[PDB]
Every structure is written in structure tokens, then in C-alpha cells.
Amino acid sequence: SNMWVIGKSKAQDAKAIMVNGPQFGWYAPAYTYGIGLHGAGYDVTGNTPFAYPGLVFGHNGVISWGSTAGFGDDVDIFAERLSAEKPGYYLHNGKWVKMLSREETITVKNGQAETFTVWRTVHGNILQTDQTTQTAYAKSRAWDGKEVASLLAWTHQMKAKNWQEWTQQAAKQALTINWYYADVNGNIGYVHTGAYPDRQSGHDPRLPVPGTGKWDWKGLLPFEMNPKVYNPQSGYIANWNNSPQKDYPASDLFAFLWGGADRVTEIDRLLEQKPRLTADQAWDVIRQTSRQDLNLRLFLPTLQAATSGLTQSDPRRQLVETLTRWDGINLLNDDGKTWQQPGSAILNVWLTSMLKRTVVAAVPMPFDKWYSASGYETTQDGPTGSLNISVGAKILYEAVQGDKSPIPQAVDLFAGKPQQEVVLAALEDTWETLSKRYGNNVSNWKTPAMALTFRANNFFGVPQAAAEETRHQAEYQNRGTENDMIVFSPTTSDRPVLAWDVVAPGQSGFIAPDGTVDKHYEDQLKMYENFGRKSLWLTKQDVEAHKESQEVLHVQR
Amino acid sequence: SSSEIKIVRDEYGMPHIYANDTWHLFYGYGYVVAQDRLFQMEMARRSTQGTVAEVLGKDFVKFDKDIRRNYWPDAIRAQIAALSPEDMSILQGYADGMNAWIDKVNTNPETLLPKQFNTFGFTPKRWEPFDVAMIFVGTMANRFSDSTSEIDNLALLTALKDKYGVSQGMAVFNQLKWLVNPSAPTTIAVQESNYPLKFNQQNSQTA
Ligand SMILES: CC1(C)[C@H](C(=O)O)N2C(=O)[C@@H](NC(=O)Cc3ccccc3)[C@H]2[S@H]1O
Ligand SMILES: [Ca+2]
Incomplete structure (x- = not known):
């Protein structure tokens, strides 16, 4: 998920512009739901995942908001000490304490039901147990007990009319979520919201802690410690699930890193290109970042250095010249199937080879496979979510930076060989692999483009529609499932706020018993593919002027 | 007037709810959701509470057990019971609104029941506050904040x-x-602030 918030000092013909692209994967019917609420203190418009009571994406005519997943480390595992003499108990603060437990029965269509037990300790639900070591692992969440409060925080924030009112609700949202603010006066802000534990001294948050009591969290850190900024001197706020702030630690997931190589830099490059950005320019960042190969910038310099003394006829050199002439923006040919340039395939084969020769070889099996992915791994349905720089590539980037990297290279990933030799060998592999598939004339290579699919199964892999309701788009675009933009105090309108979004395939998922799809079942599909957008109305007069239908209900609680 | 809820849909079908109190506002929202996304929502509910195998069969048992193993439903219910009346009205209005439409659907299924119910062989049941809470827990908290x-x-x-x-x-x-990497691009520039805490990076919990 990406977001760029452009404040007063960076906006052209407006005081502030907010552009959000939450990346949740692509589904039919739509992941998010468009909704306007007016009355009982609310006056809001936007869209939100699974129609939560709180709109994650929207505005209220005074302020606007959005989010990106935070990925802070708000989860730790406690290793509970068990005893075969006392089943169902664990040692905590010097006593054997009873676990909580509950029975659950799974009822099964055309099958036999199954019952199992869920166990829970003071540290959380038990994930797994090792009878061999008499250890049970419990998952502790900093937000445990604040789930409902988090839902309400996302609802009450919609009534905020300024930064202090909004941050009062941001402090109540306990999940690890980046929240963003913009307003009519051109103020912008960000808060890496959530509950984070205050860990004991010596606790390495990447690895399990004993559950016997000494390693218990002291409590939760105060709101003052959450990363936040209001009207930053840069004039903008950009995020693509990258680090919130200097020295802030990421999720403990082994495949997730905040390092020198980060896809958010593609947004910064576009924001810094021009002194000010108009709303149309800010929207156009979606199309550019959507099509941007993320590895070209990271590895082109290394490739250029490795091939700099090669003769013109050396194929290792000709692959790199091809990359040098490219800005990394992919575009479809007219067949709607292949990319105009072959650079992503060149980088994918090269990077795969590189990782196998370097990070993969340094890591013992079977953990080595966590580092072998190039970042280009798909499905013939296309990527299930955003594309990113792989973990292995982020680690390789640090190695190729030499002493520019702040990470000690405890193991030389090049194993005593000159980096150039390994880069070149990987280039030799790349030429062999691609030239065998496509021949030796690089200029006619028509490499496959990724496609995009609006899946009929939800993210859990559970049907949310019939399989024929799956929708297909030729161009994969590394962008939000939805995109929304809010423009504050435009100089081109007297309205204090203008806002747009796109919710594809459409607002409705309704299909009548006879197969007749709703009139709003697929009317935003083309608009999504072409980077179009629809107006989000807020005022009674705007809503009335664009009214298709209305119902009036009379209800008593 | 206290009882009135006005629903206006725009040219892309997006609904705008007009109401005069919290319960009625959220009832209107639930109602339009039940009109637009009933099967999606029903299936989301089953996904978030691990009741998919009930309708879809044996291929979802492990899935359902895995969902149920990762939460403690009574704790969620205890949080709902602790809500003030105004907060409770959000979740209750929303469930009540979906229910009003669900009831209309089950009264005239020959024109109002989403086709997918016929296809998958079951009919929709009513909702409670817990179910609305669980949509958010299971698709937000568990998807993106439980890693x-x-x-x-x-x-x-x-x-x-x-x-x-x-x-x-x-x-x-x-x-x-790495615990942290100082060259990571940060949304907040270092001139603005830095995070003040330093963490152990040698597994000293078991040293
Ligand atoms: C790590 C991920 C698998 C993937 C990635 O970074 O490779 N990311 C996203 O889109 C970002 N997802 C979101 O930001 C989703 C989100 C959540 C809450 C509010 C808005 C957007 C992360 S996870 O999916
Ligand atoms: Ca952790």
C-alpha cells in the first residue's frame, strides 16, 4: 500500500493533496465498499474494506484520512514451560498456572464434524507445542483486548476537524497501521499508530522469550513514542510500507526488511522531481509507480560497473546496455500480452542467479529457500498483491554497496570472489537462458507481461462469488486495490475539498436469482484499468444533483 | 423524524445515508451493505469465524480450525459488553440494518436472494454486533497486524x-x-525526529 500526502509548500493550485493506494489484492466483488454517512455528528464520504463502520479512506469536508499497513513489531512469542506431570498447566511467576481452554466443533457440509481444543495462557493463544521439550508457544499481541476499541477509533476519527481531535482517536487505534491526515488549511500529518510493548531490557524482539515471568512485557509504550510528524519540513509524507522513522524497528517476519533498498524511493523520486505538484500530477504518480520495475534502480549501477570494460560484442554488456536505455517503466505492446522492453525479464533471471550464488549459498538448508525469490514470482492470474523488492535482493543490495552499507557483512556473500566475477557470471546465465528462449536479437524479444485478476475467492481463499465472476485485466499495475485522492482548497474551484476514488469492479455485487447482474456490478472496471476516477460527493446539493435513486425508511429501535 | 432514514444512491450506485441518531445512521449503512454485498459479507463472516466448512465442505476444515485457534471469541464479546450505549449503537445499528434487508430477502427469495446462495446451497441468517466486530478483527487485525x-x-x-x-x-x-538498518528510507525525515529506543540484538533473553 502506498500513500503520498502533499502539503502547502509542495502543492500546486491547492493547499494539500492526499493520494492513497491501499494494496489488499484484487477481488470480485470489490474489496472495499463506497459509502457516505450524514447525521449523528458524521458528514463523510469515501470507501472502506469489508464495509467496516469506520471508513479507512475518506474525508469529511474539513480533513481527509487514509492508511497503509504499519508492519511494526507488535507481536512476540512466549515459550511456556510445561510439565508432563501437570498437563494443561504452565509455570508463571513461580506457580503452576492453569491454561484457559475451549472446545470447538467444526461442522462440515457432506462430512463428519470435528472437535478440537484451543488453549490460551496469560501471553495469548497457544500456537504449537513440543511434547519433546515440554514447551508450548503462545502468541502475544500488544493490541490484545483493544480490537473493538480499534474499530471504534477508526469510526470516531471521521468526526475530527483538526490534528488534535484526530490524533486523540489515532491514539486509540491499537493495530500496527500507518494513519495519514490532510486538511483544508493545508496541514498534513502522519502517525504510525498502534500499541507496542515496553519490553524488558535484553529482549531481542525478533526471537521468542521465556514465558516463566521474568521476560514478560512491562506494559505498553505510551502514545508519545509512536512515530508521528505534523507539517514536515519536506512538505510531503510518502509511504509504501517502508520504515516510519530513523531507528524504528520492523516487524520480526524474516521476509520483511527496512533497508537501503526500498520501493518507497520510487515515490520520492517523483515527488522531488518538480518543486510543486498539481492534483493531476499527484494522481499520475499512481500510473508511474504502477509500472515501475523496482529492481532496475538498485542494481543497474552494479551491472554497469561489472560490464564497463567489456567489448561491444560481449552479450553480458549488451544486456546491460539494454537496461541502461530504459527507465524501468513497463508498457504493453499492442498484443496486450507482452511488454515493450525485456528489462524485467533480464533483471529477474539475473537476480535469481545472483541470489542462488550469494545469499542462498550462505544460508543452511532449508532456510536458504527464504532468500531465493527474486520479487517477480507470480501466478498465470498475475500477482496476488503488490510487487516489492525481495528479502534476498535487499540483503544482496547491502552486499553490493560495500562499505556504503551500515550492515556488517559477517559472512562475505561473494565467498572471497570479486563481486564483478559473480555479477558477470550471473549475466552469462541470463544471456544463456533468455537467448535460448527468444533468440539472439534482443530488440525483437517479446517478454510476457504480468496480468491482473479480480479474484472470486477472498484473500483467505474462500469463495465470495462464483468462479465465473472472476474479472481479468490485461495490465498488471502495482497499485492500490482502490485509489482515492482528496484535494484541499483548490485554487480552481471555490469548494474547500474535491475528492475522487475508484472501486472496481463496481459498487454492487448483487446478482438476482435469474442471473441478472446489478446495474452497478461492473461499471468501474474500465475506469480502474485506464487510471480514471469518479467524484466522491459529500454535500447534500452535490449528492442530490447526482442522484440515481432514493429510499426513505421509517424505523423504530 | 427520529425514525427516518433517507438512502440516496449516486450514478455509480454509491449510497449516502441520512439519519438523525447513531443507531439509525448505522442501520442505514448495514441495510445498504446487505443490498449490495450480502454474499460477500456472509462469506466474510464465515471466513472470520471459521464456519466455512459448514457450507463448503471438507476442504475448509483445516482453514476453520486455524481461524478459531487464532482468536478468543469470549474476549471479543467482553469488549462489546463494555461499550457505552453510543458505541454499542454503532455495531447494533449496523447489524440491525443488515437484518432488516436479510429478512426481506428470506421473505421473497424468488426475486431478492443473491444467486450465489442458490448456487452454493444455503440461505443467509441474521447478524449481531459480534459478527460486525469480527469482520474487522478477522480481515484487518489478523490480516495486517498479527505477523x-x-x-x-x-x-x-x-x-x-x-x-x-x-x-x-x-x-x-x-x-x-537486521534489527534496524540506518540507511532505510523513512517516512519521517531524521531532521524531524528519530525513535529513541535501542533494542538487544543478540537474543539476550536466553543468555
Ligand atoms: C508485506 C505485504 C505482504 C505487502 C508487501 O509489502 O510486500 N504489503 C502491502 O500492500 C501492505 N499491505 C497493506 O498495506 C494493507 C493495508 C492495511 C491496512 C490499511 C491499509 C492498507 C504490505 S502486506 O500486505
Ligand atoms: Ca516480535
Whole structure:
């Protein structure tokens, strides 16, 4: 998920512009739901995942908001000490304490039901147990007990009319979520919201802690410690699930890193290109970042250095010249199937080879496979979510930076060989692999483009529609499932706020018993593919002027 | 007037709810959701509470157990019971609104029941506040705020120490899964602020 918030000092013909692209994967019917609420203190418009009571994406005519997943480390595992003499108990603060437990029965269509037990300790639900070591692992969440409060925080924030009112609700949202603010006066802000534990001294948050009591969290850190900024001197706020702030630690997931190589830099490059950005320019960042190969910038310099003394006829050199002439923006040919340039395939084969020769070889099996992915791994349905720089590539980037990297290279990933030799060998592999598939004339290579699919199964892999309701788009675009933009105090309108979004395939998922799809079942599909957008109305007069239908209900609680 | 809820849909079908109190506002929202996305919502409910196998069969048992194993429903219910009347009206209005439409659907299924119910062989039941809460818990909290690989991390660290020795193994862990990396691009620039805490990076909890 990406977001760029452009404040007063960076906006052209407006005081502030907010552009959000939450990346949740692509589904039919739509992941998010468009909704306007007016009355009982609310006056809001936007869209939100699974129609939560709180709109994650929207505005209220005074302020606007959005989010990106935070990925802070708000989860730790406690290793509970068990005893075969006392089943169902664990040692905590010097006593054997009873676990909580509950029975659950799974009822099964055309099958036999199954019952199992869920166990829970003071540290959380038990994930797994090792009878061999008499250890049970419990998952502790900093937000445990604040789930409902988090839902309400996302609802009450919609009534905020300024930064202090909004941050009062941001402090109540306990999940690890980046929240963003913009307003009519051109103020912008960000808060890496959530509950984070205050860990004991010596606790390495990447690895399990004993559950016997000494390693218990002291409590939760105060709101003052959450990363936040209001009207930053840069004039903008950009995020693509990258680090919130200097020295802030990421999720403990082994495949997730905040390092020198980060896809958010593609947004910064576009924001810094021009002194000010108009709303149309800010929207156009979606199309550019959507099509941007993320590895070209990271590895082109290394490739250029490795091939700099090669003769013109050396194929290792000709692959790199091809990359040098490219800005990394992919575009479809007219067949709607292949990319105009072959650079992503060149980088994918090269990077795969590189990782196998370097990070993969340094890591013992079977953990080595966590580092072998190039970042280009798909499905013939296309990527299930955003594309990113792989973990292995982020680690390789640090190695190729030499002493520019702040990470000690405890193991030389090049194993005593000159980096150039390994880069070149990987280039030799790349030429062999691609030239065998496509021949030796690089200029006619028509490499496959990724496609995009609006899946009929939800993210859990559970049907949310019939399989024929799956929708297909030729161009994969590394962008939000939805995109929304809010423009504050435009100089081109007297309205204090203008806002747009796109919710594809459409607002409705309704299909009548006879197969007749709703009139709003697929009317935003083309608009999504072409980077179009629809107006989000807020005022009674705007809503009335664009009214298709209305119902009036009379209800008593 | 206290009872009135006006629903206006725009030219893309997006609904705008007009109401005069909290319960009625959220009832209107629930109602339009039940009109637009009933099957999606029903299936989301089953996904978030691990009741998919009930309608879809044996291929979803493990899935349902895994969902139920990762939450404690009575705790969620205890949080709902602690809500003030105004907060409770959000969740109750929303469930009540969906129910009003669900009831209309089950009264005239020949024109109002989403086709997918016929296809998958079941009909929709009413909703409660807990169900609305659980949509958010299961698709937000659990999807995006419940990520840890510490047990796998420890397995990696153990393998690294077996291959390189205790000290080099820990240093290689710190090269592949660094705690922090100062060259990471940060949304907040360093001139604005930096995070003030420093963390142990040598597994000193078991030292
Ligand atoms: C790590 C991920 C698998 C993937 C990635 O970074 O490779 N990311 C996203 O889109 C970002 N997802 C979101 O930001 C989703 C989100 C959540 C809450 C509010 C808005 C957007 C992360 S996870 O999916
Ligand atoms: Ca952790």
C-alpha cells in the first residue's frame, strides 16, 4: 500500500493533496465498499474494506484520512514451560498456572464434524507445542483486548476537524497501521499508530522469550513514542510500507526488511522531481509507480560497473546496455500480452542467479529457500498483491554497496570472489537462458507481461462469488486495490475539498436469482484499468444533483 | 423524524445515508451493505469465524480450525459488553440494518436472494454486533497486524550457529535479519525526529 500526502509548500493550485493506494489484492466483488454517512455528528464520504463502520479512506469536508499497513513489531512469542506431570498447566511467576481452554466443533457440509481444543495462557493463544521439550508457544499481541476499541477509533476519527481531535482517536487505534491526515488549511500529518510493548531490557524482539515471568512485557509504550510528524519540513509524507522513522524497528517476519533498498524511493523520486505538484500530477504518480520495475534502480549501477570494460560484442554488456536505455517503466505492446522492453525479464533471471550464488549459498538448508525469490514470482492470474523488492535482493543490495552499507557483512556473500566475477557470471546465465528462449536479437524479444485478476475467492481463499465472476485485466499495475485522492482548497474551484476514488469492479455485487447482474456490478472496471476516477460527493446539493435513486425508511429501535 | 432514514444512491450506485441518531445512521449503512454485498459479507463472516466448512465442505476444515485457534471469541464479546450505549449503537445499528434487508430477502427469495446462495446451497441468517466486530478483527487485525515468524527465526539462528559458530552465527543472523538498518528510507525525515529506543540484538533473553 502506498500513500503520498502533499502539503502547502509542495502543492500546486491547492493547499494539500492526499493520494492513497491501499494494496489488499484484487477481488470480485470489490474489496472495499463506497459509502457516505450524514447525521449523528458524521458528514463523510469515501470507501472502506469489508464495509467496516469506520471508513479507512475518506474525508469529511474539513480533513481527509487514509492508511497503509504499519508492519511494526507488535507481536512476540512466549515459550511456556510445561510439565508432563501437570498437563494443561504452565509455570508463571513461580506457580503452576492453569491454561484457559475451549472446545470447538467444526461442522462440515457432506462430512463428519470435528472437535478440537484451543488453549490460551496469560501471553495469548497457544500456537504449537513440543511434547519433546515440554514447551508450548503462545502468541502475544500488544493490541490484545483493544480490537473493538480499534474499530471504534477508526469510526470516531471521521468526526475530527483538526490534528488534535484526530490524533486523540489515532491514539486509540491499537493495530500496527500507518494513519495519514490532510486538511483544508493545508496541514498534513502522519502517525504510525498502534500499541507496542515496553519490553524488558535484553529482549531481542525478533526471537521468542521465556514465558516463566521474568521476560514478560512491562506494559505498553505510551502514545508519545509512536512515530508521528505534523507539517514536515519536506512538505510531503510518502509511504509504501517502508520504515516510519530513523531507528524504528520492523516487524520480526524474516521476509520483511527496512533497508537501503526500498520501493518507497520510487515515490520520492517523483515527488522531488518538480518543486510543486498539481492534483493531476499527484494522481499520475499512481500510473508511474504502477509500472515501475523496482529492481532496475538498485542494481543497474552494479551491472554497469561489472560490464564497463567489456567489448561491444560481449552479450553480458549488451544486456546491460539494454537496461541502461530504459527507465524501468513497463508498457504493453499492442498484443496486450507482452511488454515493450525485456528489462524485467533480464533483471529477474539475473537476480535469481545472483541470489542462488550469494545469499542462498550462505544460508543452511532449508532456510536458504527464504532468500531465493527474486520479487517477480507470480501466478498465470498475475500477482496476488503488490510487487516489492525481495528479502534476498535487499540483503544482496547491502552486499553490493560495500562499505556504503551500515550492515556488517559477517559472512562475505561473494565467498572471497570479486563481486564483478559473480555479477558477470550471473549475466552469462541470463544471456544463456533468455537467448535460448527468444533468440539472439534482443530488440525483437517479446517478454510476457504480468496480468491482473479480480479474484472470486477472498484473500483467505474462500469463495465470495462464483468462479465465473472472476474479472481479468490485461495490465498488471502495482497499485492500490482502490485509489482515492482528496484535494484541499483548490485554487480552481471555490469548494474547500474535491475528492475522487475508484472501486472496481463496481459498487454492487448483487446478482438476482435469474442471473441478472446489478446495474452497478461492473461499471468501474474500465475506469480502474485506464487510471480514471469518479467524484466522491459529500454535500447534500452535490449528492442530490447526482442522484440515481432514493429510499426513505421509517424505523423504530 | 427520529425514525427516518433517507438512502440516496449516486450514478455509480454509491449510497449516502441520512439519519438523525447513531443507531439509525448505522442501520442505514448495514441495510445498504446487505443490498449490495450480502454474499460477500456472509462469506466474510464465515471466513472470520471459521464456519466455512459448514457450507463448503471438507476442504475448509483445516482453514476453520486455524481461524478459531487464532482468536478468543469470549474476549471479543467482553469488549462489546463494555461499550457505552453510543458505541454499542454503532455495531447494533449496523447489524440491525443488515437484518432488516436479510429478512426481506428470506421473505421473497424468488426475486431478492443473491444467486450465489442458490448456487452454493444455503440461505443467509441474521447478524449481531459480534459478527460486525469480527469482520474487522478477522480481515484487518489478523490480516495486517498479527505477523510474527519468531519460531522460524530461532530455527534460522540455530542453523546459522551450527554452520558458523555461536558468534559468527549470531552476526550472520544480524546481516540477514537486521534489527534496524540506518540507511532505510523513512517516512519521517531524521531532521524531524528519530525513535529513541535501542533494542538487544543478540537474543539476550536466553543468555
Ligand atoms: C508485506 C505485504 C505482504 C505487502 C508487501 O509489502 O510486500 N504489503 C502491502 O500492500 C501492505 N499491505 C497493506 O498495506 C494493507 C493495508 C492495511 C491496512 C490499511 C491499509 C492498507 C504490505 S502486506 O500486505
Ligand atoms: Ca516480535
